[PDB]
Amino acid sequence: GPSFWLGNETLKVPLALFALNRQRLCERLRKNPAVQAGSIVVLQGGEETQRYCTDTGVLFRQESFFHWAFGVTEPGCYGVIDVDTGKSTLFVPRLPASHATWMGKIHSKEHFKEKYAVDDVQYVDEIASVLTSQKPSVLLTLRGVNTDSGSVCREASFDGISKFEVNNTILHPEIVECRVFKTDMELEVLRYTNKISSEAHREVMKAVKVGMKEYELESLFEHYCYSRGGMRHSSYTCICGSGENSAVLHYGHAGAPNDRTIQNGDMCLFDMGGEYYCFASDITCSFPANGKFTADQKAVYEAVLRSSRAVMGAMKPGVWWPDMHRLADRIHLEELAHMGILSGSVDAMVQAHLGAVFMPHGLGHFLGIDVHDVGGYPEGVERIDEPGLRSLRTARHLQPGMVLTVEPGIYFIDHLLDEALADPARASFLNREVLQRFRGFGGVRIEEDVVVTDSGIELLTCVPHTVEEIEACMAGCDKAFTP
Amino acid sequence: GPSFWLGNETLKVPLALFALNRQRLCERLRKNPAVQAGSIVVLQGGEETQRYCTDTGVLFRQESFFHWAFGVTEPGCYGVIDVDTGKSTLFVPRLPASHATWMGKIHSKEHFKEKYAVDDVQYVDEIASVLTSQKPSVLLTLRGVNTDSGSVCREASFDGISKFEVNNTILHPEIVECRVFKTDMELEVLRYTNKISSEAHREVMKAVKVGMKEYELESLFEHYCYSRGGMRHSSYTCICGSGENSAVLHYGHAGAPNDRTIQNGDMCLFDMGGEYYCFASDITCSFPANGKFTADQKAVYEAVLRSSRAVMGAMKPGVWWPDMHRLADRIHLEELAHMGILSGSVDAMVQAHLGAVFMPHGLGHFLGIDVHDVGGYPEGVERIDEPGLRSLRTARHLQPGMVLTVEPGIYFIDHLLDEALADPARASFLNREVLQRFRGFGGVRIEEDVVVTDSGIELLTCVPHTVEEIEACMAGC
Ligand code: PRO
Ligand code: PRO
Ligand code: MH2
Ligand code: MH2
Ligand SMILES: [Mn+2]
Ligand SMILES: [Mn+2]
């Protein structure tokens, strides 16, 4: 069957991937005792947008649930799936004749049927008549809360939908659960997004020079991903933090726009990931700007490497993800004590939540069509109300097919360090005579993407993440070179 | 005073630029007989957005009117201007402590006052209290219709605004008219955006090879503009049309996403422009993929070059922009007739609107903060209901300080050609036996950005646009 492909060395993605997702969704809904016979899933695709009131078009990127079910890149579509039969119908806009002058060929409905391997294609303005003819019992629309944004997924609507019975509660938890477990075809795409992003990270590490602006490397990363990977989008705005900016977890946004000059002795923390056909990647490489770790930089880096490796070695089905976060905390505290930054009982440090001073974010998150992917907190899975752990994007137990980031880090964040020094329950663990030397260090994060298997994990990422590999990469060594 | 700068060789833009815009706006409002003493202009900045219901942040780009007035890059702000005194007050978000962990330094109000050279800075949550203290007669908010999108500019709102008298009709035409006329400081930025975009077009022309995907050149263009020019955004989605796609005027969007392989013998039409600090550029280069014009490609190309140069040379204050569009039409028809595609009286072809078959779009448009900049059709300026001219984005007469694109083109668009061939009033002019050789040609567009001066124009763009220049650039010369 047909495939999405951007030529050259880019990945061919079979449209069968989306047919399987639809099949899996129907199979799950058929098992759901509350789903009525004759139900139809109704999804509304994204629409094209402009900047504010101007006619400046914004490049259209499909809504993620609609993409997951259909793989459709055109704006203005709807899509329906008959639960009982699995039959799929794509609704496409009826375009004006002038479209052929300004925007491109006005493809036939049959063109879209063959392109997307759906069972039927109709025009959007006929949706009410088409659905009436199918005599559905209930329309299942999409409404629910994203647990990272807090936003409500807005459900499909069309003129005449009020004449149908509409249920907007069943579908969201079910399609979310389908998205949590990646198919073999989806894993091929996530292997590819990690491959290209890993290559781009290596090119960035080879290119960094003292005196460059952070955004020069953002630009290079995105250029590699697009020109060599066909990744028109990134999965999120590139985080290119040098020096003290490496302690700012989502640095690089419009208010702090990757505009610092890289200086000798700085650590760089580059958290970047290209997106291919709406599939994410998320990789973080930390490294010295000048290509040579100092003793202090090596020690911090090695501490995060130890926690990364311990978590990856422990991950398997049945493991509770908060336990991995606590494991990383304990290891960071142990290693910071071995460095002389902390002293005393690590057991007592953990009770005082001292780990969250150095790692205020979650250990890692589901990844998929969204970089912070859906399904981390389904009903009954509670957020843990403690420093650090409350920022975890899931508190689930690991199961085969989940895709997670593993991204421990250690940072030197002045307001968190000063809070600890003002708190009698935490202050005594800090050795200011050594800590002072790490003020303004920034931080280190080591992030890889992994798949939970039947017995452990598969590593998707291939970047230089040991001290020796990093120094070798920055010295221009071939990838195949093993220091 | 302070300047916006992204380091390296990027342009330092003085924040005085925006102070001058605020002063010019107040000067216009003070002359408006409907404006009451004690009025305050209230603008609302753009807010950060995410992809649909996800937490995936969209890179924030400021709303154009707010940028024009204040130059502010942070989301979530408001800005007000006392009309009588010109005093400016910026309102910034009061950020939570966690901002320092996740997003960066929590700058003080004094930092923002120094950065933006405004008279006062307050927190957004104080806007109602601050404005109440000033006892305004009326708040002037922004509402009006963009004549390219048809969308309504949404006016500022804040908690408590219902307690004030609000006027939402006066401001839009006045701030639009100020944007139409670029200051010398604005022109310096548009010279720079054209400089970097021109350099990037040259790099793209040198890099094009048969067998590449169109999007490889989109990527290179944007990489040059960002890494070398500090242009994090483009002014619009890059149009990288090869072969038949060069006849698709806004090719490159998500439904036709620059995904064709460039083939030997194809024409390329690359319409791309980087954006620096929310100032646009818009440049188009057309050229043969293999670096050598065929006779047919050269003839089409030189026809568009002729109209490009004729229009630029005729532009001066007082010229009616529709006349320039018709001038390009007439030249195209003359040249297509010389090539044997057309036959008969060019005067009669013009009366039949045949030029619009080959150039269905407007000759060019205002350019500024937005690539299709505001103010093309103020009240009293009417759109001309004829093929081609109806797509003109302004029907104004030219005046000094206006910034225009000049972008004639000739395209071979099947449905327009076929409609003309069905019409006995136009079919006689077309020679099917010659036209058939140009079916699937695509098209040629040549675009320059210019400023109207007291005596003529100043050309901002510097790209290879003669056949000799193009072939030399592409041969690695
Ligand atoms: O948002 C998160 O969960 C991770 C933490 C570091 C940056 N991204
Ligand atoms: O939209 C416009 O007015 C011009 C015509 C060709 C592409 N841009
Ligand atoms: O977390 Mn990247
Ligand atoms: O027209 Mn660009
Ligand atoms: Mn991540
Ligand atoms: Mn233009």
Numbering used by the authors:
A (entry chain B): 6 to 488
B (entry chain A): 6 to 482
What do the study's own words say?
Prolidase Deficiency (PD) is an autosomal recessive rare disorder caused by loss or reduction of prolidase enzymatic activity due to variants in the PEPD gene. The PEPD gene encodes the enzyme peptidase D (EC 3.4.13.9), also known as prolidase, which is the only enzyme in humans capable of hydrolysis of dipeptides containing proline (Pro) or hydroxyproline (Hyp) on their C-terminus. Prolidase is particularly important in the degradation of collagens, a family of proteins where proline and hydroxyproline account for up to 22% of the amino acid content. We presented here two high-resolution crystal structures for the p.(Arg470His) variant of human prolidase.
The electron density maps clearly indicated the presence of an imidazol side chain rather than a guanidinum group at amino acid position 470, proving the success of the introduced amino acid substitution. The obtained crystals were transferred to cryo-protectant solution containing 25% (v/v) glycerol in mother liquor supplemented with the ligands of interest (20 mM MnCl2 and 20 mM GlyPro). Despite an apparently unaltered active site architecture, the bound substrate remains intact. This was in contrast to wild-type prolidase, where a substitution of Mn2+ by Mg2+ ions was necessary to capture the substrate-bound state. In hProl, Arg470 was located close to the active site and it formed hydrogen bond/ salt bridges with 3 residues: Thr289, Glu452 and Glu453. Glu452 is part of the active site and it participates in catalysis by coordinating both manganese ions. In case of hProlArg470His, substitution of Arg by His resulted in lesser number of salt bridges. His470 forms interacted only with Thr289 and Glu453. Significantly higher B-factors could be observed also for the GlyPro ligand and one of the Mn2+ ions in the structure of the pathological variant in complex with Mn ions and the GlyPro substrate. It seems that the lack of interaction with the catalytically important Mn-coordinating residue Glu452 could therefore cause flexibilization of the active site.
